[PDB]
Amino acid sequence: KVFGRCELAAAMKRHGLDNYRGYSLGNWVCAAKFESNFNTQATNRNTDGSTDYGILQINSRWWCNDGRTPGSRNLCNIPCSALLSSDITASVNCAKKIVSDGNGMNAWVAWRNRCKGTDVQAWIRGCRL
């Protein structure tokens, strides 16, 4: 599923991400835009052999099992394919574990390089939330 901007904002809000660990909703929408272009089916392979999955491009080296990342952890205890669903619940629940992990949203490279320090409230402007 390719979400609309306000559609995704409202789904993330319903799942408890607004101000989760201090990060306003606009941060999460901005990260999803630049990680996946709002597409739940996005995948991208990394040089180390790991793969990033779904709307928030969660990585198989630490967070999910894809059966082909040797010596990886599965800290969200899920198959990586579950992150590609049109229902974002699994992605959100795993993202909450990541952002609690220590370096916050800096774990998402696109957030650090394209969202951090910008006017992220613009990503929810106009939405009925």
Rounded Cα distance between 79 and 21, Å, is 25
Strand partners, 43: 53
Pairing outcome for strands 51-53 and 58-59: antiparallel
Asked if 60 touches Na ion (CB under 5 A), the answer is: yes
Residue 36 in contact with Na ion, rule: CB under 5 A: no
To the question of whether residue 101 is assigned a binding role by annotation, the answer is yes
CA distance readout (Å), 94 to 62, 72, 105, 119, 124: 11, 16, 13, 26, 22
One of 57, 59, 72, 91 touching Na ion (CB under 5 A): 72
Q: Look up tokens 């599965």; give the residue.
A: 74
Which partner from the list Cl ion, Na ion, none does 69 bind, CB cut-off 5 to 8 Å by kind? Na ion
Query: Which of 36, 40, 57, 69 touches Na ion (CB under 5 A)?
Result: 69
Residues 6+ apart with CB under 8 A from 112: 105, 106
Q: In the bound complex, what is the minimum distance in angstroms from residue 121's beta carbon to Cl ion? A: 18
Query: Interface with Cl ion includes 96 (CB under 5 A)?
Result: no
How many of the chain's residues bind Na ion (CB under 5 A)? Answer: 5
Task: Please say whether the beta carbons of 61 and 50 come within 8 A.
Answer: yes
- Backbone φ and ψ for 14, nearest 5 degrees, come out as -60, -30
Q: Return the residue of 6, 41, 81, 104 that touches Cl ion, per CB under 5 A.
A: 104
Residue 60 interacts with, from Cl ion, Na ion, none (CB under 5-8 Å by kind): Na ion
| Catalytic residue list | 35, 52
Binding site for Na ion (CB under 5 A): 60, 65, 69, 72, 74
Binding residues: 101
